[PDB]
Amino acid sequence: MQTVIFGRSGCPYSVRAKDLAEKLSNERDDFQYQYVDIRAEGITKEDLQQKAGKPVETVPQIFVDQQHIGGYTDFAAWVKENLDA
Amino acid sequence: GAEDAQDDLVPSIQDDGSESGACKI
């Protein structure tokens, strides 16, 4: 499992979304987590929405096993569908 | 006159899925 995060270093809710993946990475051995800047790196929600195939407006901006999965919102609901299911 | 602008918080910090935050470059 590979989970990739676009822009931690820029806002607290994006950090919380990153931290959720890192927290899961702490909890298990299957689950690997990756952080990539967008505000530093010169990337934006206009780039991310094209790559993802879906018009995005705001954060979070996460991908799981190379696929777009929102982040803190999607990820909490996804984690819940496993651990609270 | 001379004032400060403050935001009240009725909800708790509960960790479960806020979908937005307008963050970028």
Residues of B in contact with A44 (CB under 8 A): 24-25
Question: Do residue B22 and residue A10 have CB atoms under 8 angstroms apart?
Answer: no
Rounded distance, CA A5 to CA A68, Å? Answer: 10
- Nearest CB to A10; choose among B16, B19, B23: B23
Residue whose structure tokens are 């803190």: A72
Q: Are A15 and B1 in contact (CB under 8 A)?
A: no
Give the max Cα distance, chain B.
41
Indicate the SS3 state at residue A80.
helix
Structurally, chain A folds into a number of domains equal to 1
Identify the CATH number of the domain in which residue A55 sits: 3.40.30.10
By the 10 Å C-beta count (0-12 exposed, 13-18 middle, 19+ buried), A63 is classed as buried
Phi and psi for A71 in degrees, rounded to 5? Answer: 135, -135
- Nearest CB to A11; choose among B16, B19, B23: B23
Q: Are A71 and A4 in contact (CB under 8 A)?
A: no
Residue A69: give the domain boundaries: 1-85
Q: Are A65 and A78 in contact (CB under 8 A)?
A: no
Task: Name the DSSP letter for residue A14.
Answer: H
- Nearest CB to A39; choose among B18, B22, B24: B24
- The experimental technique behind this entry is NMR
